Ligand binder design. Structure first.
Ligand SMILES: *[C@@H]1O[C@H](CO)[C@@H](O)[C@H](O)[C@H]1NC(C)=O
Lengths: 213, 219
């Protein structure tokens, strides 16, 4: 009984812009439909209930409309902290089905990454492993590329990247690239460098350090 | 005010079962259903079931019946969720939730949520992290903590006991080919502070009852 279909699954808009999320039901359920926000690393939080009622304490830019089988969540003036997954839910009776969820991203102005490189700690070398880290800080858009060089030999198969969620204040990304080597390999070679390509950079930016100094 | 507090993150092997607890406070526990919701790795919220604490009556989503037992202890205001025949696909954050506290019918939207409980399905043993410093080089300076070789997720990193937050980036954990997690936490600060300001990162890994503090000095 009653399937819930949420669209779009993904969305991208600017600050102060108006966006709309859609919840279609396969059948009427008396408008007992709630809207939840789930922000990165947070528990869900209700925005709207009874199709169109704004929960107390929820910002005014949130509004629900619709009835029968067609429902809408509107954000009339998008803010950075609205980066989240949005969910529709029926609560007329069991089952309390959730929608598939709609992920919202902030489109902002292009920004180049600030690049920092971190040698392995003396401490770590005793484990037999060396972790070289490359931080790409505060960039947009999300697409970036990191290439490791050890004495100018490009590296492959021995590194991992991790991206932060879009910052809820400046809408930028950060990325970490870890190069993992044996202690023998790390003390074999001298010059450790990461080369960053991003659409806000005219040419690749390299950061390097010399082992020892 | 109303609060739901759940048990800590947990690891259980394939086919092993797990029991999660949800202690309630700030209202009459027996007069309202406890609902259970889950978020699998790369999935949306999934309603699992409901339980009445007065009667012990239960109802489950088709995907979950014959897999879930909802119980309670009314004397300590606790609800429990038992899940059997654990598979790779059952790795998820599990939430308990309750309705808004009101007399009237038709307010069974989930106003209140437990903090959540990460449940990890794997035969890998538990391990506390090693924390290594990411020392500032050579203005704006970047420094951080490498939290390496822990299992399962999650860890919490804070800076100067929550004192420092503006400029903090904690990366999502990445599972290495070793079968253990690693993440980094970094922070951009004024250069002129490395001489006077103390920068400590606090790493809590609760599945191993591990608490490490690393001082980050310029090398
Ligand atoms: C409820 O919990 C307490 C332990 O905190 C225990 O003494 C008691 O036997 C339990 N009773 C029921 C009915 O679960």
């Amino acid at each position: 009984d009653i399937q819930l279909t949420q669209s779009p699954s993904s969305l991208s808009a600017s600050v102060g812009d108006s966006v709309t999320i859609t919840c279609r039901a396969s059948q009427g359920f008396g408008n007992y439909l709630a809207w939840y926000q789930q922000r990165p690393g947070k528990v869900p939080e209700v925005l709207i209930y009874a199709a169109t009622t704004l929960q107390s304490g929820v910002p005014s830019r949130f509004s629900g409309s619709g009835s029968g089988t067609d429902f809408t969540l509107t954000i009339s003036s998008l803010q950075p902290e609205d980066v989240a997954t949005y969910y529709c839910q029926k609560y007329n009776s069991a089952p309390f089905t959730f929608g598939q969820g709609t992920r919202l991203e902030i489109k902002r102005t292009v920004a180049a990454p600030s690049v920092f490189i971190f040698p392995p700690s003396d401490e770590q070398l005793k484990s037999g492993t060396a972790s070289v880290v490359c931080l790409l800080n505060n960039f947009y858009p999300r697409e970036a590329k990191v290439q490791w060089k050890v004495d100018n030999a490009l590296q492959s198969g021995n590194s991992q990247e991790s991206v932060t969620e879009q910052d809820s204040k400046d809408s930028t990304y950060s990325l970490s690239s870890t190069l993992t080597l044996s202690k023998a390999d790390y003390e074999k070679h001298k010059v450790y460098a990461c080369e960053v390509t991003h659409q806000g950079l005219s040419s690749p930016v390299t950061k390097s350090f010399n082992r020892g100094e | 005010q109303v609060q739901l507090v759940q048990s800590g993150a947990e690891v259980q092997k394939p086919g092993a079962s797990v029991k999660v607890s949800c202690k309630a406070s700030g209202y009459t526990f027996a007069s309202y259903d406890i609902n259970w919701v889950r978020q699998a790795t790369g999935q949306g919220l999934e309603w699992m079931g409901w339980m009445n604490p007065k009667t012990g009556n239960t109802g489950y989503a088709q995907k979950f019946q014959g897999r879930v037992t909802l119980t309670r202890n009314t004397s300590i205001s606790t609800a429990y969720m038992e899940l059997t025949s654990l598979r790779s696909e059952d790795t998820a954050v599990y939430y308990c939730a309750t309705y808004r506290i009101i007399a009237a019918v038709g307010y069974r939207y989930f106003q209140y949520w437990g903090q959540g409980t990460l449940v990890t399905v794997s035969s890998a043993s538990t391990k506390g992290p090693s924390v290594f410093p990411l020392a500032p080089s050579s203005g704006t300076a970047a420094l951080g903590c490498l939290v390496k070789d822990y299992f399962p997720e999650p860890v919490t990193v804070s800076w100067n006991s929550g004192a420092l937050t503006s400029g903090v980036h904690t990366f999502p954990a990445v599972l290495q080919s070793s079968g253990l997690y690693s993440l980094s936490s970094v922070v951009t600060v004024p250069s002129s502070s490395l001489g006077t300001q103390t920068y400590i990162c606090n790493v809590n890994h609760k599945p191993s009852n591990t608490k490490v503090d690393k001082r980050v000095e310029p090398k």
